[PDB]
Design a binder for this molecule. Structure first.
Ligand SMILES: CCC[C@H]1C(=O)CC(=O)O[C@@H]1CC(=O)/C(C)=C/C[C@@H]1O[C@](C)(CCO)C[C@@H]1C
Ligand SMILES: CCC[C@H]1C(=O)CC(=O)O[C@@H]1CC(=O)/C(C)=C/C[C@@H]1O[C@](C)(CCO)C[C@@H]1C
Lengths: 121, 125
């Protein structure tokens, strides 16, 4: 892969939960886009179950004709940070979900995945 | 300022709506965190009222010990794009709101301000 962020999305796209989980450092956090904190902090032990959930949601939206698009990661001037823009589109192209992840890396592992999404409210 | 992004947050914090507005290109869009799009698109003519609404929003949080923090922009490898992380916090430090802006700049003006915020919830399902 071109980077550990590329590896994470490539594993996910493959359904390799274990491969994606291994992209995270043992002290990593996933800062979810919704929750009381605001957002929600998931530690590495808690992340694997999130990846299982996401794999089954991915297959369910695909069966409805939806298309999940993850843009190529763009690194910041700080090379240990990068953003990944993403969206969910109906089959014709309409966007129903859109967000961005801010990654923090350390020593080739993901240390923070900070997830944001538009509120279609 | 050290960039038009620095200028924008300097002028907004002063309540200088006109100065903050002038940071936007005439064809700029402010993509708000919430709406049906998802998010909500504001063109430059609609941004000024948003800036006034936000200006009286700031007074009401200011008038309650709440402080907003806007981090220095960090640019992408595309030097016309940058992220600004931000947070609103109570006096005692509790985080009330937190988000990130993705800026697209062009010819020294803001072309896109793409706003994302964490959703404060007990749970999503
Ligand atoms: C199980 C709940 C966990 C999600 C949240 O509620 C918030 C969060 O921070 O984490 C998750 C949200 C998240 O990460 C993304 C990228 C969602 C995007 C969607 O993901 C799909 C299902 C593909 C993944 O396989 C297609 C679509 C673009
Ligand atoms: C930065 C505004 C971007 C907002 C939108 O795109 C519309 C929306 O739905 O959500 C976004 C986020 C939002 O609304 C708030 C309230 C952000 C913080 C607040 O900004 C103040 C007014 C200072 C800026 O001058 C003080 C306070 C910390």
């Amino acid at each position: 892969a071109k980077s550990v962020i590329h590896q994470f999305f490539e594993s996910g796209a493959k359904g390799d939960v274990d491969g994606a989980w291994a992209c995270f450092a043992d002290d990593a956090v996933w800062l979810a886009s919704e929750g009381p904190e605001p957002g929600r902090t998931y530690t590495k032990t808690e992340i694997r179950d999130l990846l299982v959930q996401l794999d089954e949601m991915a297959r369910t939206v695909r069966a409805q004709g939806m298309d999940g698009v993850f843009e190529e990661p763009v690194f910041l001037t700080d090379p240990d940070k990068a953003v990944v823009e993403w969206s969910l589109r109906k089959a014709d192209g309409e966007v129903v979900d859109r967000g961005i992840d801010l990654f923090t890396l350390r020593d080739g592992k993901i240390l923070v995945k900070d997830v944001f999404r538009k509120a279609k409210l």
